[PDB]
């Protein structure tokens, strides 16, 4: 029986580059002129967005997506935090999401039921191993898991047989 890996990953070196291109895209913008504002990338997973303002950080928002895709990141994996703000300025933590929770993976495993295929899904650590009779079933399942409203950037690999 064939199988393949659903995964949620995002590359570490590429989202480290995203965070310094944003940080450098910021020392180009008149309007960060002297501007104390800034990128963290914090243990590969969380961004921390800080500027004096909460309108600063939305720009920065729009610096980090449009590098995040510019390195080949689906940007729906980034989960905003609320915008902090005290006398210092605002701050925000944006969690880079990895890895399909057991929440996310039952969820998964359901609409594959819903969508009555013919694979049998199970939960590996933070992946989803799918398994079919056919290869032509597993992809009917990637077509089905590609086109879903999910919360979660999908990528797929280890095909086994």
């Known amino acids: 029986m064939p199988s393949f890996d659903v995964i949620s990953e995002v590359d570490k070196h590429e989202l480290t580059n995203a965070v310094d291109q944003a940080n ?3 020392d180009t913008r008149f309007d960060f002129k002297g501007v104390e504002a800034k990128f963290e990338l914090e243990d590969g ?3 921390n967005q800080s500027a004096p303002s909460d309108f600063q950080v939305k720009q920065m928002t729009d610096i980090l997506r449009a590098r ?3 390195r080949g990141i689906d940007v729906r994996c980034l989960e905003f935090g609320d915008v902090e703000t005290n006398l210092a300025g605002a701050r925000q933590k944006v969690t880079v999401k990895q890895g399909i929770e ?3 993976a039952k969820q998964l ?3 594959l039921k819903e969508a009555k295929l013919k694979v049998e899904a199970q939960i590996n650590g933070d992946k989803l191993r799918v398994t079919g009779k056919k290869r032509d079933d597993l ?3 990637i077509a089905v898991l590609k086109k879903a409203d999910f919360e ?3 990528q797929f690999d280890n095909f086994r047989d």
Do not use: M, S, W
């Open 102 to 104: 057991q929440k996310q």
């Open 45 to 47: 997973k969380v961004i």
């Open 68 to 70: 995040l895709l510019a």
């Open 109 to 111: 495993v359901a609409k």
């Open 139 to 141: 992809q009917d399942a």
């Open 24 to 26: 450098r895209e910021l």
């Open 152 to 154: 979660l950037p999908l």
